[PDB]
Point group: C3
Chain length 433, copies 3
Amino acid sequence: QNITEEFYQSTCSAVSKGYLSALRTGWYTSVITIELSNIAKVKLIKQELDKYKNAVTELQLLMQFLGFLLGVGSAIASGVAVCKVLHLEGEVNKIKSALLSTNKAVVSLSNGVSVLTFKVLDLKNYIDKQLLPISNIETVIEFQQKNNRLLEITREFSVNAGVTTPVSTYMLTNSELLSLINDMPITNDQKKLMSNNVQIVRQQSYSIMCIIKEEVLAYVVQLPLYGVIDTPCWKLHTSPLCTTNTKEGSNICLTRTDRGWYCDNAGSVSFFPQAETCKVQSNRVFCDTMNSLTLPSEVNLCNVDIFNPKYDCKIMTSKTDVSSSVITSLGAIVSCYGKTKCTASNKNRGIIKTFSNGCDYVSNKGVDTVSVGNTLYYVNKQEGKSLYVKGEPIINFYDPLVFPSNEFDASISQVNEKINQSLAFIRKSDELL
Amino acid sequence: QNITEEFYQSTCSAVSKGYLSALRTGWYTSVITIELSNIAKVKLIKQELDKYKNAVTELQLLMQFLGFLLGVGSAIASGVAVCKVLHLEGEVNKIKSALLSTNKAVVSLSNGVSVLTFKVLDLKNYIDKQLLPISNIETVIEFQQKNNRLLEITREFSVNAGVTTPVSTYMLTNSELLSLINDMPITNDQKKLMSNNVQIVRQQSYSIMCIIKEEVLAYVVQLPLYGVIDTPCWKLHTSPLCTTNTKEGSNICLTRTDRGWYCDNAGSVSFFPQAETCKVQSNRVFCDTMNSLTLPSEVNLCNVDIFNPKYDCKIMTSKTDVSSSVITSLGAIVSCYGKTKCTASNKNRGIIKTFSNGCDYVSNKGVDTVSVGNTLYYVNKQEGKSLYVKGEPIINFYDPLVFPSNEFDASISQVNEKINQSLAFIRKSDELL
Amino acid sequence: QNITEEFYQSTCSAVSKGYLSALRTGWYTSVITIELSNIAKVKLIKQELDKYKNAVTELQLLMQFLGFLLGVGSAIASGVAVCKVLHLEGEVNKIKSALLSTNKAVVSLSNGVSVLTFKVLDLKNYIDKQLLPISNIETVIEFQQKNNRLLEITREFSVNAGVTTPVSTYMLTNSELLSLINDMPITNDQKKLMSNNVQIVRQQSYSIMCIIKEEVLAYVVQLPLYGVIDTPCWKLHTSPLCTTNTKEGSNICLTRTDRGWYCDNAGSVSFFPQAETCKVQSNRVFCDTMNSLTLPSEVNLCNVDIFNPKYDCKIMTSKTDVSSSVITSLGAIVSCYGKTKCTASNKNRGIIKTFSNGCDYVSNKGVDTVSVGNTLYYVNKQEGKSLYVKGEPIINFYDPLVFPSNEFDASISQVNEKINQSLAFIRKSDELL
């Protein structure tokens, strides 16, 4: 897989490279229908047939740091747009007519939308051609199986107010989901990616209850669409970088705020400031463009040179020199300040390194845990090569007398400009004397 | 329903009107009891009777932007207050005695609390009057049905440490929940609202495990109380408003921070800064006053005039001119800055509008998606009328030389006051020359 | 239990004492294995045996304020480290060989890790010694019971992408979990604590799907380790403290930002800024050191004296004088400002106190609810003694002309230092006249 990582002592940050993209860029909606019946061991069927009427009753009763820079979307706007078309007159019968001979038919909606309608369960057929004439053991088995799926679908929709996620196997089975993947108009690369990670596909999917009317239960499944695949991705880990003066309250701190996931995307870079919104499966990174910013590709220069003139690297400043650790992909960043006991240990041998005041780093080769104060961090044991890029911490380049003490959404240039405003004021008033 | 929306080009904000309120203002607590038994196809009953003892064993083992301005409540403080009364001596028998003939009896607690006690399952009767004498198929059916509910109730309480939400149908069935709604001392308007949105009621409810003692399992259901209904509500959408100078790093930005839900409430306005804490069902807005601030009604003047003297409109400032979009109720706000490609498209025809640098807006009439950079947003297809209120963007009225560069919790007056402090300093030092 | 609480009028804060610690400090990993079969009422077994093959198919398809100051850990790094060892050649057979006679055997891994391997379900034995020879009712019962557990384990892993939490009873039963607690190398105090709060243990546990290969399904259970028990804990509640001038926009506010849980830990204090990450069971406080900072023990002096020279107490400043309430353990803090109607009421008697502008406090003795504006707060009815420590609000000691108007991550000394910079500038320019 070749996962690599570089730590930067100058900026107290680390970049993990070698990942491949899998970005949710669009949606694939399809209408899923279940035909209903409008109504010895028969006591078993009578009981199961009353669970049926309770599920129909429940369904009809249902319808009567930089994360703040992100936009605001409507996650199920595309799926709900299909439900509202189905509420029109004759639109449900257009589906019920095309699904009279086959189970998977493309019904063009009245507004020119080509939805892939798929009937997955035919209780109308099984109830109207097997039980209304009224004894084999398979008949009670085949009914308790088809009815159990309707009960689970009803169970999820009632507890989730008609919108469920992830999409369960009762909403859409693997045999049916893999059938949709082979029929949607996408690349073979996209089909192979979805087929090998169906659980990730289910977690990024939505199941929206639309309508139950005229012996038909319809709900829209909103499937993810991966329009960006196999592009380079890298994760940026940052930690506070402070000075280490002896007396408390005399130290200045600096933290890069642009941490998160980065993936090359169409000549630009997609930046995901909330790394918790991306799921990692080996070297594949599943993200969602809804939680991303589109930045110029020059943003990658901040990791090698934070003072470059092409991009203005984002930082925040404070005077809070508290100790903590950031567990990276192949190691651990450690910000040790004050009287905190910061160590890195091995399970078989114990403490093998004691960190000094400042920001340091250790790799997972030989290290299993790090301890910062009273917090024990287990490190990731992923195979990969780390590189310790030595350098002077940039916080030493600043004079604490004219240092902007508390900025939350600043940058290297904003700090330098605010320093010049202070130095120019000192310069002009020193001349008065 | 008549949902309307106005966009304000001067402040890069939009207001969606035409909604009706449904605010959770109080709680209705009731004690739910399940009487227990203290102990051919009999092999089916013996198996189901051991699931019974496992559930009893598990139950006894169980008991041995402006969101930061909100207060801090205790969500289940009212329900837990009822559990602690039931732990007193003889208080469980007061319930077990009044529920000896009827299933729904009002037992006045020792501290003057009038709780509506409701026995929903009588396993003590079914086990002590149908199986201890010891073969009909209905007896195995009626026992596997009553026992399955106890197993599900036990399943939810163990995984949730005795506090579950939403309240499932096993905790309280629709027939029992609708019985409680008809018996609680509230308006007919309140009863009709809860009966048509039982799934929303379940999501705003709590189920608290109290005690299992003396053949009685007691748990308190905490139901929502909607003391504010059918008042006007409106949602405010905001987006960053920046200048569009050519060179990077020379632009100033301004964002209204008072976005969220607003509902008229008792001469004041309830403001919900986290719009994700409110659920929209058509034109009804279900919120919770616990996540609200009580503001004067003059706060609505900020949408028409952000420089009014009656209310001080809240804004934040920055120099970060990143592009993004905010999906409104009937359209989309687009903040396009820098080299970002911002478009609005139709599914059948493609790109129909290309946005320029600045803050613009488009309605859902004819537009299905907007693209900002690498992010594709689907717009809501709700029926409604939008109005583009043209105006000069207020960010052009400020001089970047004396602009407060980074404020996170400021207002129009706070910015103007900080500008005067800079202009008065420039004025008095220019006179020295 | 002796829960006490002191309110501090000078700083608008309250401390709840009398709690005992239960801190998750490490992890206990163990490998859980399920042996699989590689393949009248027989129609019931044929149906259940096809559910078996569907579960095996699904499993193989699965593998192909101050919170921002916290560090970043990898929660399942220790459990995943054990999965990656099991993927090595012959490592699964080392477990399958040692579990040939007994169900609980310690298999030393190839990297010197001593994992406690535990086989909980033997479907390979039941299928290969009871059904392949092919009619008793118990055989269909004993198979539908063992198979149902595999179906639930498969159900949770598929919807959670192979990592589930809390750990359900199907992943690990109470009889098996209590067996692991008695065998792990910890104190009797630690074993008794886990045995009385198994549901809390399950909520702090992880179940990680490792591998399914060679008729063996292996998944690692990651159990919490409580290395800090029965130490004093206390919770700090804070609320905005503002001036109460008549005209709007002329008031300054001050809020202590160090609210959260505090527990004495190894000569230092573990601070949990997100009190929502700690669970309270009576007087026991279950937290996780991953969400904690390690502060000096002198931090407790801020509650008695916020101007002490030993520790620099953290505060934030603003001009936003909005009303709200903070529900404490034994009472309620009320910040009433402006025209807001703030009251405290009793259920039987109604309003018993009307708050004035400023920050006040009331205890739960006699008070059941407080109302701030349009928000009704229920107070906790925990038994305990409150103490109202009177004092002058510190916000009156500041001159609004030289008050730092908006600081988000500041302290008492940072504010005083920024005031001296303003007073020294006023002093030197007044001399010019």
